[PDB]
Nucleic acid binder design. Sequence first.
RNA 1: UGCGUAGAGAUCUGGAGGAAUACCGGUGGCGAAGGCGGCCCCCUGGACGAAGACUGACGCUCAGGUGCGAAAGCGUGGGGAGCAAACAGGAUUAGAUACCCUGGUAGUCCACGCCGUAAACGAUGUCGACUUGGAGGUUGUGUCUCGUGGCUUCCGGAGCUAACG
Lengths: 69, 116, 86, 95
Amino acid sequence: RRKFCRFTAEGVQEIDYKDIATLKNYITESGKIVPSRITGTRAKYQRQLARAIKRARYLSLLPYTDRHQ
Amino acid sequence: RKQVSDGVAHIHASFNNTIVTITDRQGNALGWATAGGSGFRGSRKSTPFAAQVAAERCADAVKEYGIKNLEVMVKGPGPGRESTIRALNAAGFRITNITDVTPIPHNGCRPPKKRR
Amino acid sequence: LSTEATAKIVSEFGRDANDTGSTEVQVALLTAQINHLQGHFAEHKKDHHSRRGLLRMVSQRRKLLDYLKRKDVARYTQLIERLGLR
Amino acid sequence: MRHYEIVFMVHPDQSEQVPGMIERYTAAITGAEGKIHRLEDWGRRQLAYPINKLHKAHYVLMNVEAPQEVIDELETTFRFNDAVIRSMVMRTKHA
RNA sequence: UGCGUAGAGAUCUGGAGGAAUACCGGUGGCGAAGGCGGCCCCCUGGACGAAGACUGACGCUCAGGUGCGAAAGCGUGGGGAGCAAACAGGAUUAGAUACCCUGGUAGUCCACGCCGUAAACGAUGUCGACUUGGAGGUUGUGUCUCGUGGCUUCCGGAGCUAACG
C-alpha cells in the first residue's frame, strides 16, 4: 500500500496505552482500528495494539468513532 | 484606560447569533459586541455578516483600551463563526493563536426539546 | 460458609469415607445454608430476591427427604433426628 | 489480611506542612494495623479535572497490608483532614 | 400581550436546593418480564471452562393451588426547581371549547399500601437427537497463522413458509 504505519514511526511499545501521539496513527478517519495491511504490524503486535487502543479509548484518550470528512 | 496591550478574544458562535467578548489575560471582559448590539433585530443577527460587524466593533472598542494582540477562543458551531475569526484576523489586532474550546459535553445533561 | 465449616459438616454426615454426595450429606449442606439464609431473613426484611433463593433450596431439600423416606425410612428418621428439621 | 493501594491526593499549595499530613498519614496507617510495603510519590501533577477548585493536586502511593475489616475505618480517618481532597483504597493490580 | 432608566436581560464571584446523570454508547451489554446504565464498600442470585474426582437416573410436563408480575390512577404523610392534564389569557380561524404563545393545579419526585393488565410481539413454550458451510464478536482449553467447548450476531446448503422470511 501507500505507507505502513509501522515504518513511518520509531520503536515504540504497543503496551503503552497513554501515548496517544503514536496510537492515533493506527486510527483511520474514524475510531476504527486500521487493518494489518495499513498498520504494518503482525499477528503478535496487532493483537496487543488492539487491546492497547481499547484501554486508551476507555481513558478517553482515543475516540471510538469519528465523523467522516 | 488600562492599556491591556494583549488579551483573549472569546467567540461565542451559535445558530442564533455570534457574540464577541474581548478580555485580558485574567479573563475580565474589557468590552463586548453582538449582532444585536450592531442594531440587527433577531433573525438577521445570526447571519455571518452580523458576525463580522460585531467582531470588528468589539475589536475597535478594545483598540481604545490599547490592546494590540489577542488569543481567539471559538465556542459552539453556527454561521458567522469563521467569519468572526477572519474579521478579527484583520482589524487592528494581531491574532496570535486560534483554539476551538467548544465544550461539546460528555454524559449527564438532558438535551432541550429541540435536541430530544 | 467457610471451607472447613463445609468440609466438616460433610464428614460428620458422610455415610462412609470420601462420601461427598449422599442423601444425608446433601440435605445436611442444604439445611446449613437454609439456617444461615433464614437467619438472614430475621434481618434485611427487604431482601426479597434472596427469599426466592431459599425457596428453591428448601424445595430441593424437601424433595431429597421425600426420596429418602420413600426408599429407606430408617435413614430418614435418623437424618431428621440428627439435623432437626420438620 | 491482604494487599491494598491507598491513594492520597492533597492540596498542592501546602508548604512545610506537606511533611506533616504524611506524618498523621503514617500515624493513621498505623494503629489501623497497616504495614506499608513500598512507597511512591508522584508529587504535584496536572489534574484531568479541577476538584477543590484547584487545578493541581499532590499524589502519593502507599501499598499496604492490613485487615480487610479495618480498611473501611482506615478511610474515614484520612478524609477528615481538610487538606486531603480524596482517598481511594483499591484492591491490588491496576491496568 | 408582557418585561425594562425605585435598573431585569447580558457578565463576573459566592451561597442554597431539587432533579437528572452531558463523551464513552454502539448498530453494544444484563435480567424471567417490566426494566437497568459515574464511582466505592458490604450482602446476594445465575452462569461458563478445565480436572474428571463423588452420587447415580432420584426423569419430563403439569388441571387446581401458591408466588411474581410495566404503566395508569388511587389512599396517608412528605416534598415541589423544572415540566405540565384540567384550567387562566393572548393569537390563528368561517368557528378552534386544537395545533402556536404567556401563566398554571393534580401529577410528575420520596416513603408505605393498592391493582394485574399490555402489539406483557421473535404477534412462533421446555428438553433430547439428526441435517452444508462462510464470516464477525465475547469466554475457556489446546500441538494457538489453527483445532476444539459454551454464548452472542450476520450471510446462507438442503428443507420449510401463502408471501415475508
